[PDB]
Chain length 287, copies 4
């Protein structure tokens, strides 16, 4: 009977931007995939189609490029400028969500202006503004890692649907997806990103895994213990199964050497590791 | 300082199941992509690698196939059985999230056991159990629609970054992604899905759009006004731009006939249409 | 020592075009993904970077849109116009390859100007011109089909690496990728495409399969025998494995009802079915 | 007319294999995606469904894993072993096509058994056997490169549909897809692949480009001039457009700094650079 407009947001998604810094002959590249969405009083736009408050998504797009001209120190700094502009430049806009994927490039043999894409990982940044409050979540994704040994899985319950054999030596492969929330905007974003990445990789490799859950816990612990500016880190790790192929039918044995890497299904272990006392239901995780 | 394990879940994702009903010569096909994740007391698994509480993801997978053998009337009913099994079958498992994508098949010339895939839309379902509470969200995605006319966009604010021209005749194209939450388990799931789908399509097609936000609002309103078992519907609609090509440089006009369908960027309009007074932020939307 | 420039072609790939026919209130939609590439004397362009002979890819793109303005009866007709234009408009351009994917749309409840995408298949067309000769290849792809029974596979040889068990009842699922070459440009392209599509589906469903190879042969035979204008048809059919899950570990039998649909690996059966006495290696197949 | 079975092949595609070398504590990882297809007398299999000659695709898959157990120096030598096995093991199998993609892994902090994927490129290998002839084509794909300056495009003809403006400074970005055919199987496959990769990257970066065609020719020439064992190299290079955004409407200039990286359409430049006198159309290119 009675319908009500609830949470809503709109903007331009996936604006691909490449910013070349060329004041000197030593060029620099910043490659981003930017998304901008605004929140506020858009009631009339939905109920009546009145666009008085609707800053065109095309305009949001143009702004991204116009602002890039001035350059930016980091992806987070760029998003902060965009969010401030939209929330303060329009009275009916009270907040929003600005996000970006950053793609890395490497110089070709140290060339001044020739590069090749480093596709081994994608960096992410998300900024959410709510009234006078703002929060930033940085992250990494697409980083595939694997341990050929030093992984075990045993001691799990065995019901009538259990057939998995316990093992003290298996491959542990996953795609590192992690996002962490800063408790302050005054951060050396690039330095922390590189640090976290290294801590996650180190924790994954050096931890004698008794379960993906434990490896993940150790990865998150390393981050929280190293960075006071991070209140929590969320990780989503798939267990990309590498099955030890049965070679007995061919008169052979398989001493943990030949594996079939299955696409699906895959285990999916996810968890939030946080600083004792910190918030557990921050709105930025709602998207 | 003190590190703590927060929210967490784990299970098997993307178990591809195809259930053939062949008690009669008239075969039926059910094609699903199932994901099962458990929630409960998994503290020791994360902090010590103690897997006593860890029902193997492989076991969760086995359960999916064993349960499918008995058959299921609908995807939602299937997920309901899985959820009750894990929560009730293990004391330390207090809840979870079970989801599925349903893929449609049509018979080949009404053949008894020959079919072709209908890839024009994917049906989804998600069940979340939290203690004694159960919540179900059904949805539809991948349904691309387009109106060649009957779409306008004007009256939006113009700042120094606005270059978009107002229009009273443009193409409106989007991919319908919609999710709605049920307020009861006693629903004719298949019948409601077919109805919601038709209402969304009907509203999109019949509404003289003054904005994508308005079209979306009308789509949601129709669903809520029609089904008492639905408390809210969320939609994420991309505005897939079809640019009217300028052929004037060649001395040709273009009366809304020739368009360039750009990939990215795209407008992204999202909103929640709720039954007045219903829950504001149900946990199921968090994931 | 001595390096020579061999075969070469260039142009604009994937020009997304949507042509709306709206002379009457009953709108029509033609949605294409067009690729244009030219062949001829481009020696200097490659060896010296002299672009006198290089019709810009941007120009080829503009030409696609300019020509679309006049409309076109079929995709093949449209490609024929483009091919003729480039080969006759430039003396150094002696031929080329023009291709297109055609996407289908259905009216939403028979509405005059509102449609939804039919993603169950994609139609293709390729025109190749070489001097005074030209050839057209039409095709279909992305059409997934499945037989729940009426498929067998036994009688295959066994060696030390063979573990496969014979069967007289299995699921036969594949993706229909087929391409046929016309022996003349005087063809009712839309009618033949529809007919061919129907012949492939009919043969797939009605042939009691003893092998995917056999089914494929029957599909090709039906097409060649029905259409005089077709000299040969090439097919690439993956055998998408649907494994009958073993439920005995759970105390249940599985009377051909519960299957695991594996992504990879997959059988890949390919063959060319030809009209006796036709060309055996037409250049259009090289691409 | 009669219907005839023309060219045909069948086998198992995309068999994902991971081979771990672990004789010492210093583990090595070989990651491949293997495809096996046989050629020969399969007439009966197609026309009568007689599978006496049909070595099961499942058997081919098993053979890949069994052979993997013995280890292999390079991907090409692995394919050679497989190819010789099937052709020499079955009288009716006269040849075939074996291919593989090789995925790279780097150690995490020089760890003995912990690695991360290098996704910046994918190495490929294709072997075709025809009687006693063994033809091998190695290649690289997915390697995206970009030059921020040192690229021009002018002097092209301006026909009635040309709007592109001449320029002496633009971004040149592409995805390096190259394949080269060896004229002998006695090659240091890993060394040549590394050399070729370096030569392509070098030519791309150091060539002052007047056209993508020129940059490509120079890349191919460098390879042929350096490797006697290579008879020809084919390249397929997309011109991934990075449009210099017009910020003048916002009162700003854009000195080659802010770009929009478009997805489609894109220029597609392709060519074959051969050693003078070598085979014009080796059958392996048909696939």
């Amino acid at each position: 009977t009675k319908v009500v407009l609830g949470q809503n947001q709109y903007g331009k998604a996936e604006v691909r931007l490449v910013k070349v810094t060329r004041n000197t002959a030593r060029h620099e590249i910043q490659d981003l995939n930017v998304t901008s969405q605004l929140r506020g009083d858009f009631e009339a736009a939905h109920t009546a189609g009145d666009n008085a408050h609707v800053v065109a998504t095309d305009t949001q797009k143009n702004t991204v490029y116009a602002f890039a001209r001035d350059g930016f120190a980091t992806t987070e700094e760029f998003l902060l400028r965009l969010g401030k502009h939209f929330t303060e430049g329009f009275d009916w806009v009270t907040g929003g969500r600005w996000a970006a994927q950053q793609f890395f490039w490497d110089r070709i043999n140290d060339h001044d202006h020739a590069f090749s894409r480093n596709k081994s990982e994608v960096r992410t940044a998300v900024l959410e503004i709510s009234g006078s409050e703002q929060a930033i979540v940085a992250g990494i994704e697409g980083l595939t890692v694997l341990k050929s040994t030093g992984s075990e899985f045993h001691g799990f319950p065995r019901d009538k649907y259990t057939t998995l054999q316990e093992t003290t030596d298996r491959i542990l492969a996953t795609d590192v997806s992690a996002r962490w929330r800063y408790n302050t905007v005054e951060v050396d974003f690039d330095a922390v990103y590189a640090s976290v990445r290294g801590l996650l990789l180190k924790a994954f490799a050096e931890t004698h895994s008794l379960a993906l859950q434990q490896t993940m816990y150790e990865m998150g612990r390393a981050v929280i213990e190293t960075h006071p500016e991070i209140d929590e880190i969320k990780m989503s790790l798939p267990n990309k199964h590498h099955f030890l192929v049965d070679l007995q039918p061919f008169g052979q044995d398989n001493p943990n050497e030949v594996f079939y890497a299955a696409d699906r299904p895959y285990g999916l272990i996810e968890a939030t590791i946080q600083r004792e006392g910190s918030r557990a239901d921050h709105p930025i995780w709602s998207n």
